[PDB]
Amino acid sequence: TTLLNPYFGEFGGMYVPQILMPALNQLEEAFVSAQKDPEFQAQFADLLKNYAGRPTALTKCQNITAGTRTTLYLKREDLLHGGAHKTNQVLGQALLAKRMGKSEIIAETGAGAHGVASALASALLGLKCRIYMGAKDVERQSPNVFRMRLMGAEVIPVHSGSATLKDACNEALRDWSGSYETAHYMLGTAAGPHPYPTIVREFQRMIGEETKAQILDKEGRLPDAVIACVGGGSNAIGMFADFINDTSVGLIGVEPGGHGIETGEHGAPLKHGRVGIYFGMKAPMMQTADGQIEESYSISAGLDFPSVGPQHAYLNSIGRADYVSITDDEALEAFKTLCRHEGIIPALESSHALAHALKMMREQPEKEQLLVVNLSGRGDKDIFTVHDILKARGE
Amino acid sequence: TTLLNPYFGEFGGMYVPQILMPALNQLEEAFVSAQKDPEFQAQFADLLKNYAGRPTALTKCQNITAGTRTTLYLKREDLLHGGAHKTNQVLGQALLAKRMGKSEIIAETGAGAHGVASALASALLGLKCRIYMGAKDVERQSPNVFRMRLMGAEVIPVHSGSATLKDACNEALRDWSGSYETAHYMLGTAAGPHPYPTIVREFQRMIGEETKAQILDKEGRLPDAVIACVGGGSNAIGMFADFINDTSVGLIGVEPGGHGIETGEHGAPLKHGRVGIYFGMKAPMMQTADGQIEESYSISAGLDFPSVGPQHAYLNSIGRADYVSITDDEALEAFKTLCRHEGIIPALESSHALAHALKMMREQPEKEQLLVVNLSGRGDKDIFTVHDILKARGE
Amino acid sequence: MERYENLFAQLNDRREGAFVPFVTLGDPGIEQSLKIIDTLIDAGADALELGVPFSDPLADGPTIQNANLRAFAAGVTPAQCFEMLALIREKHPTIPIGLLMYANLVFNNGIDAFYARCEQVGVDSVLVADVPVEESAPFRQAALRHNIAPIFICPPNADDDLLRQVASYGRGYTYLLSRSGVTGAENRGALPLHHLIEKLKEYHAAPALQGFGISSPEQVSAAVRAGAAGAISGSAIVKIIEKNLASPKQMLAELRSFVSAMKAASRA
Amino acid sequence: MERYENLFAQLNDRREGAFVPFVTLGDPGIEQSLKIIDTLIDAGADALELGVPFSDPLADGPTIQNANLRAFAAGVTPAQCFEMLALIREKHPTIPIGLLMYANLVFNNGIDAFYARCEQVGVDSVLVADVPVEESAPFRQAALRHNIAPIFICPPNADDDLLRQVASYGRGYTYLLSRSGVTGAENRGALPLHHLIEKLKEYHAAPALQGFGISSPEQVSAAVRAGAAGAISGSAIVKIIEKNLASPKQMLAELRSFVSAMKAASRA
Numbered sequence A, B: 001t002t003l004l005n006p007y008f009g010e011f012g013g014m015y016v017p018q019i020l021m022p023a024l025n026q027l028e029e030a031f032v033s034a035q036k037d038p039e040f041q042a043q044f045a046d047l048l049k050n051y052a053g054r055p056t057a058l059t060k061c062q063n064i065t066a067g068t069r070t071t072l073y074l075k076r077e078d079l080l081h082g083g084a085h086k087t088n089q090v091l092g093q094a095l096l097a098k099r100m101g102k103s104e105i106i107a108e109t110g111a112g113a114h115g116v117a118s119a120l121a122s123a124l125l126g127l128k129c130r131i132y133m134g135a136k137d138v139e140r141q142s143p144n145v146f147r148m149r150l151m152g153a154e155v156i157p158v159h160s161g162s163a164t165l166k167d168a169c170n171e172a173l174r175d176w177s178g179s180y181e182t183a184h185y186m187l188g189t190a191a192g193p194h195p196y197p198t199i200v201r202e203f204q205r206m207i208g209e210e211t212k213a214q215i216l217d218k219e220g221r222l223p224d225a226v227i228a229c230v231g232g233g234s235n236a237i238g239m240f241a242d243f244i245n246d247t248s249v250g251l252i253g254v255e256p257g258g259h260g261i262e263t264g265e266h267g268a269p270l271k272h273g274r275v276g277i278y279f280g281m282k283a284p285m286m287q288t289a290d291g292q293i294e295e296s297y298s299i300s301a302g303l304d305f306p307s308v309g310p311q312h313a314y315l316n317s318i319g320r321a322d323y324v325s326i327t328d329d330e331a332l333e334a335f336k337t338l339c340r341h342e343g344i345i346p347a348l349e350s351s352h353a354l355a356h357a358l359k360m361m362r363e364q365p366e367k368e369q370l371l372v373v374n375l376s377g378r379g380d381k382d383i384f385t386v387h388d389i390l391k392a393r394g395e
Numbered sequence C, D: 001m002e003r004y005e006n007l008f009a010q011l012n013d014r015r016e017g018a019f020v021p022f023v024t025l026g027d028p029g030i031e032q033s034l035k036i037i038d039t040l041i042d043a044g045a046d047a048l049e050l051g052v053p054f055s056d057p058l059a060d061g062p063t064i065q066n067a068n069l070r071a072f073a074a075g076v077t078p079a080q081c082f083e084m085l086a087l088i089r090e091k092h093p094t095i096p097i098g099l100l101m102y103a104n105l106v107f108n109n110g111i112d113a114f115y116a117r118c119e120q121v122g123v124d125s126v127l128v129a130d131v132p133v134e135e136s137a138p139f140r141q142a143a144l145r146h147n148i149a150p151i152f153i154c155p156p157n158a159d160d161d162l163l164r165q166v167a168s169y170g171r172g173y174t175y176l177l178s179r180s181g182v183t184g185a186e187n188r189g190a191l192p193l194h195h196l197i198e199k200l201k202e203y204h205a206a207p208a209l210q211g212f213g214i215s216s217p218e219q220v221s222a223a224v225r226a227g228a229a230g231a232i233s234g235s236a237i238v239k240i241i242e243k244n245l246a247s248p249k250q251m252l253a254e255l256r257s258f259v260s261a262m263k264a265a266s267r268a
């Protein structure tokens, strides 16, 4: 029994060990209660505005669309405190943790952005925070490990499996299953068991709300499409949510194509996987013929996850949202292009969304289109990775 | 002959080789013209809001003042695009460069924050940017070198002298003296020859303006004091300017005390130097008995400069503003304290201002005081330096 | 069939509890796994709980994680596990065989088809670790259609509604969780479970086996004394495999003595 | 005194231009510097321009930057430079001596006191590199009070107002800048300066010496042919010091031949 619908069509649900159901039910109840509580809402609003820096800018990028009929705006989640959109929902979930009397936080991270957001919110609000991070991601996103430790969070390297995000998720869930009385699992994306896909969307939806208001103010109309990268689904559903009922507005999610879909080394289960049950949810999975969960791959640690949140699978199934992929190389070009021509250093994750927008423009340069890319984070964490890549290319 | 007063009392002026006077006069004229030009103002406003992310939050920090009668707010220049207040005036000066038909930018940097700001503004606005940076600062603020190069700026290591900020300034000025027809010198602080101290203040004054409005909204009165670190003077004068005529409001600037004033290894000329002529201005200098300019020292590359802007020297002389110092160790403690208790990672520069505010609180804990610290930047650039220090301490 | 029903009736007559070992099928290889399982039975196991190697066993701690990995290193697939189950049932006609599954392996090629295959090879029960009661409908329906007992978990944090559901929906045995957390011999359950055991009996639930953290004969006796019908032990058994990889002979000897001792504890 | 006035009157009578070398005082040491300066004079220098080592010489390129550093390595101070100037004037009663100063060294112990010291030791002019006309009042006033010629710069980018000011305020000689930029032999001035030379003459300015980038006899002749009263050469001279640090004898020989050749170029 739940208060809210755990499914989006066939996708979603609560596929966790029985032991964890009371924790999920408690979380759902606290969320429903909080959503009706003006004091909770005011506290949340206060943190978003005065601590995190909302609303974020919507930047019109002129140089990179020159000579085309594309007008491109970037929603600047890269300017949020912490440096990524991850901060928004962490503030809301930390307040739920406190509401439920939890004193500890467990989080997974890949890009380290969610880890950093979890650590900063825990420092501010008086929670003891432990982060699971794949050992591969520890190296390729190291700036973030430094940040987390300085803010007093415990960072636990995970060497199992691919030593990336999936493996960190696994460990976080294992931990929670034995510590849920005292620890809240601050899941970092719009995926996992209900009620997380719902909560994460509702605590990210200000992205799209602000975008809509900003676009109307500047352009007097809605965008033709909004475009976001999809790792687990949070920044994209945060951008999409307020536009779902505006049927003229394209919703485009960009999965990582890695070394190319045909190589099998990608993170694009929504379009190239098949429905399975893992990480608490029924959702598209990269899986073997036999039903073993595969390892994903992306140059971007934050998109390196072999599944996807269920609301995205649903929105795809009904044709409301469209999903595409962008390779490592395409994302790297978009990264370089934004740095050099707009003076903005984007996260490699967000660079996937940008790459698709640039493709939309370049493929049809005389098509009039008003586009918004969710610039989900800044790329400080990626500057060393990108350096090493460009160096090996002799650039 | 000038349009504007080049002096603040005895301090300031235009002590450059004759060759550079037309460049200074042209810059002054363009500034005076721009300040009266609604189109310039609107373009500048547009960039500050929609590109840089202004206005910045004013955050009330609760944990770190618990048990005292200090209320402490942080003005969040760390959330500005680029990660420091340096971005504000760079946008204005880049627009002046364009107004004057310059196609190239020269900048010095120490912390790399001004370098990054110069590079990003040049990428956006179509200028070819070259940055001088001391070789010591290249290492201790390396994240910034990566950022500048990705945005297409040329970064030139300076090995001369102390291989720090002073030396970079020297090289930038030498360069400008032979390239001023095509290159604008985008000086990174409220110092140097007129009209730079005036321009930099006017292009930073939104800091204090916003602070005043925010404090009034939240507290219904002005702050007892506003507190800022002083490297060359820009973030501090940006905070101070709008409060100068509010005589009840304390203006406190914090110079780096380095290893301690008594060691001579500091960057505190305003309080521990004496008036001299260097870097285009008559201003307090760290100098030998013989009148040679000394080398400064600070753990923080951005404060490691042996002089200070003339308006600060003036405001000190008349008693309108008070100047103090904070040592490397005091700044490190403030850094750690903010990370752990507010979940904000501050620049080591800004940490000097915070340290003084914490001292004001701790020394007199039952004194009722409403304080604002200008949190001039984020400390991403410093995380490696701080790690290495804490590691060597066995922390 | 009625393998559990017959076992518990026989056990009740001898006034004894069940000892039920867990191992991963194909750990550390198919042939050695088959020998291990024969040794468990010869040493006095009353039933088996058998894990199919899964890529991401989220209810398992390191010991059994490593069992899964060893099986995968030997190239063990679900198909080969079904071949093994056929060979085990062929040798041992009466022993109840329960599978420990993760959902994706059951869902992968169709839920109904999975249970149909279990029936074909002579499996008696299926426990799907990451399917709570709330999601159980298609699993339990398919199980019952194919004469497989659906195994439900009664956690220490079970309320009355959950006891009633588990009592109604389950067959074969009720799984009584020692404690929160994941599998492992290093963490023993700290909560007394007598109240849950009595409630299950009142609601006519399948007989209860206690599992998680059971690593010593004393804990086996205590479960039985507390009113449970027996106990399951996994990590403790798997540890003996892991310790003796290089000596298959000493592996079997040590498994025999351990199982013997654990089983003897169920006799009073 | 009137050392410049006498020099230019003598030069005009011989229909020739001045050749004026620059060196840094105390580069590469006090004793060697004194010998270098005697060699410059013996080889035909008409006047001297002498730099006092300064920590931050912002109008100087690498060659002269390095001269400053060498002097500092030898521990040379402004006080020791004044001692040297006394020794030079003691040997050479008639040669005009101009200092190249940076502002802080003049301001440091009081502007008036600085010029008083210059007068005491027998210096004829002072050029303060980082003081434009706009800031010059206390410097030029103190210079004139102590019978020192204040040297003003006429840049290539000079407007009419600046020509008039430089003509009025200056004494001794007018410094005619070859080009923008800093000192150095590697960058030769590209602008013709004949228009500025004529305007200075019309406004009765002190005679003009061209400086910056003058490294060859041809450039000396060209300055004189263009109507200037002579030329200054610094980096070219200092390069010979730098090249010959390890051979003081070959240093002096090479300085002699260079200065001889440069001076000969001023004769037509």
Ligand SMILES: Cc1ncc(COP(=O)(O)O)c(C/N=C(\CNc2ccccc2O)C(=O)O)c1O
Pocket: A084, A085, A086, A108, A109, A110, A111, A112, A113, A114, A115, A165, A169, A187, A188, A189, A190, A191, A229, A230, A231, A232, A233, A234, A235, A236, A301, A302, A303, A305, A347, A349, A350, A376, A377, A378
């Ligand atoms: C700037 C930026 N932009 C986009 C993304 C993509 O994540 P999305 O917006 O949720 O789709 C990330 C994801 N980053 C991860 C992965 N986070 C993550 C991903 C999947 C499962 C669990 C996770 O913690 C992290 O741990 O920070 C990001 O940092």
Ligand SMILES: Cc1ncc(COP(=O)(O)O)c(C/N=C(\CNc2ccccc2O)C(=O)O)c1O
Pocket: B084, B085, B086, B108, B109, B110, B111, B112, B113, B114, B115, B165, B169, B187, B188, B189, B190, B191, B229, B230, B231, B232, B233, B234, B235, B236, B301, B302, B303, B305, B347, B349, B350, B376, B377, B378
């Ligand atoms: C975050 C932050 N906070 C405060 C400061 C202090 O500089 P202030 O606010 O101007 O006093 C810096 C100064 N940083 C320098 C030095 N900039 C600099 C300093 C002195 C002379 C020339 C310079 O370019 C840079 O080059 O970025 C900073 O980064």
Ligand SMILES: O=P(O)(O)OCCNS(=O)(=O)c1ccc(OC(F)(F)F)cc1
Pocket: A017, A018, A019, C022, C049, C050, C051, C059, C060, C064, C100, C127, C128, C129, C130, C153, C177, C182, C183, C184, C185, C211, C212, C213, C214, C232, C233, C234, C235, C236
């Ligand atoms: O002795 P231990 O601690 O290794 O435990 C052995 C357990 N092996 S098992 O197949 O019974 C078993 C039973 C239930 C499990 O998860 C669930 F409770 F969520 F369903 C996992 C394994």
Ligand SMILES: O=P(O)(O)OCCNS(=O)(=O)c1ccc(OC(F)(F)F)cc1
Pocket: B017, B018, B019, D022, D049, D050, D051, D059, D060, D064, D100, D127, D128, D129, D130, D153, D177, D182, D183, D184, D185, D211, D212, D213, D214, D232, D233, D234, D235, D236
């Ligand atoms: O031959 P070069 O290129 O080395 O030039 C030698 C110049 N030495 S100097 O003392 O005349 C001299 C004259 C003026 C200077 O700066 C100023 F113009 F700003 F005032 C600097 C040095």
Ligand SMILES: [Cl-]
Pocket: A007, A008, A009, A314
């Ligand atoms: Cl739905």
Ligand SMILES: [Cl-]
Pocket: A007, A010
């Ligand atoms: Cl359903």
Ligand SMILES: [Cl-]
Pocket: A029, A030, A031, A033, A034, A099
């Ligand atoms: Cl609640």
Ligand SMILES: [Cl-]
Pocket: A035, A036, A041
């Ligand atoms: Cl609400």
Ligand SMILES: [Cl-]
Pocket: A149, A150, B390
């Ligand atoms: Cl630490």
Ligand SMILES: [Cl-]
Pocket: A156, A157, A158, A159, A171
């Ligand atoms: Cl781990």
Ligand SMILES: [Cl-]
Pocket: A055, A209, A210, A211, A213, A214
């Ligand atoms: Cl808005």
Ligand SMILES: [Cl-]
Pocket: none
């Ligand atoms: Cl509305």
Ligand SMILES: [Cl-]
Pocket: A216, A217, A218, A219, A220, A221
């Ligand atoms: Cl409009």
Ligand SMILES: [Cl-]
Pocket: A224, A225, A248, A249, A250
């Ligand atoms: Cl559309």
Ligand SMILES: [Cl-]
Pocket: A247, A248, A249, A250
């Ligand atoms: Cl549409």
Ligand SMILES: [Cl-]
Pocket: A270, A271, A272
């Ligand atoms: Cl599909």
